[PDB]
């Protein structure tokens, strides 16, 4: 197993941990803030995924400082993860194209 494939796997594991802890911490941060909707675990997990993917429908979002901080860690974990898979795919295409030119 090559470095870029293990990093991708690692990144996917890590992002899943971030998604989970983000659900837990987002609820812990937003309860206590009147009007907040990000306050039960299942839908927080959905919110963390749609945040990590940068979709952002708008059905659920944090309104507190610490919930926004948690939000940012999720987004950056998401963008870095999905970017690292792209970097990994590129190393694969590039090695296969060195081979196919006899380098």
């Amino acid at each position: 197993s090559a470095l870029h494939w293990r990093a991708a796997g690692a990144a996917t594991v890590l992002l899943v941990i971030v998604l989970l802890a983000g659900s837990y911490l987002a609820v812990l941060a937003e309860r206590g803030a009147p009007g907040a909707q990000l306050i039960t675990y299942p839908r927080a997990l959905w919110w963390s995924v749609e945040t990590a993917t940068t979709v952002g429908y708008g059905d659920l979002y944090p309104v507190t400082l610490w919930g926004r901080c948690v939000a940012v860690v999720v987004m950056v974990a998401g963008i870095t993860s999905f970017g690292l898979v792209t970097a990994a795919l590129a190393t694969w295409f590039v090695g296969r194209e060195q081979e196919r030119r006899g380098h």
Partner: antibody, heavy 118, light 106 residues
Framework: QVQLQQPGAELVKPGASVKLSCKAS????????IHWVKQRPGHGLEWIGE????????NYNEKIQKKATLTADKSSSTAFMQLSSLTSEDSAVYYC???????????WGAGTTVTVSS | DILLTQSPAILSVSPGERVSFSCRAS??????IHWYQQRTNGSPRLLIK???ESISGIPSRFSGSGSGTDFTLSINSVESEDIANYYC?????????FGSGTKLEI
């Protein structure tokens, strides 16, 4: 099984304080919230506050005079509610309830009847 | 905070008839409403969760419907064990709030 065990009664002199307890059994998860609900005789249900015992954070009903302080003891699976400086407005039945973090009170304690009198 | 209105306060029905309790929320709460029953000298009991989902141990007699702001708890064929106060409660926005109660009366 009985999943929440509360004492039946507490007499409290006006101005004094008292610490209600609520021992939980059954399944206990890190995600568990314990809620406290005040009901005055012939009135309805009034949400007082909530605590997450695995972390110790508590949030309170803003709309009513803060009479409560919530704590938990992770070792004994017991949640406490400290009601301080009571008047006859504070005489009521106080339930605790367990909420798995998904929004509803699946199980309730039998309630503790608090009487403020001399 | 979300205000839950339960009107009427008392509901008179004849045995075997079908009865319906209304819960109106002051703004849209999707389906995040739950129903409790409290008999004289009892503690509340979850009857229905998330507007319509069944709880195990609750007679099939009870059902729920509704979304958004208007919600209904129904009893197909009332009987005397159903005499009690019925409360709704939302979990869509912090803090959780309770309806004011409807007494069933036969």
């Amino acid at each position: 099984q009985v999943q929440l065990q509360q004492p039946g009664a507490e007499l409290v002199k006006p101005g004094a304080s008292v610490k209600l307890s609520c021992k939980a059994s059954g399944y206990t998860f890190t995600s568990d919230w314990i809620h406290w609900v005040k009901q005055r005789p012939g009135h309805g249900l009034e949400w007082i506050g909530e605590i997450i015992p695995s972390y110790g954070r508590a949030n309170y009903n803003e709309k009513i005079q803060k009479k409560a302080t919530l704590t938990a003891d992770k070792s004994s699976s017991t949640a406490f509610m400290q009601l301080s400086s009571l008047t006859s407005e504070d005489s009521a039945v106080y339930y605790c309830a367990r909420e798995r973090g998904d929004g509803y009170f699946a199980v309730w304690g039998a309630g503790t009847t608090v009487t403020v009198s001399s | 905070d979300i205000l839950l209105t339960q009107s009427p306060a008392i509901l008179s029905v004849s045995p075997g008839e079908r009865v319906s309790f209304s819960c109106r929320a002051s703004q849209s709460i999707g389906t995040d409403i739950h129903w409790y029953q409290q008999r004289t000298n009892g503690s509340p009991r979850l009857l229905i969760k998330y507007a319509s989902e069944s709880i195990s141990g609750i007679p099939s007699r009870f059902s729920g419907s509704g979304s958004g702001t208007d919600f209904t708890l129904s009893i197909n064929s009332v009987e005397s064990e159903d005499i009690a106060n019925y409360y709704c409660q939302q979990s869509n926005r912090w803090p959780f709030t309770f309806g004011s109660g409807t007494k069933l009366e036969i």
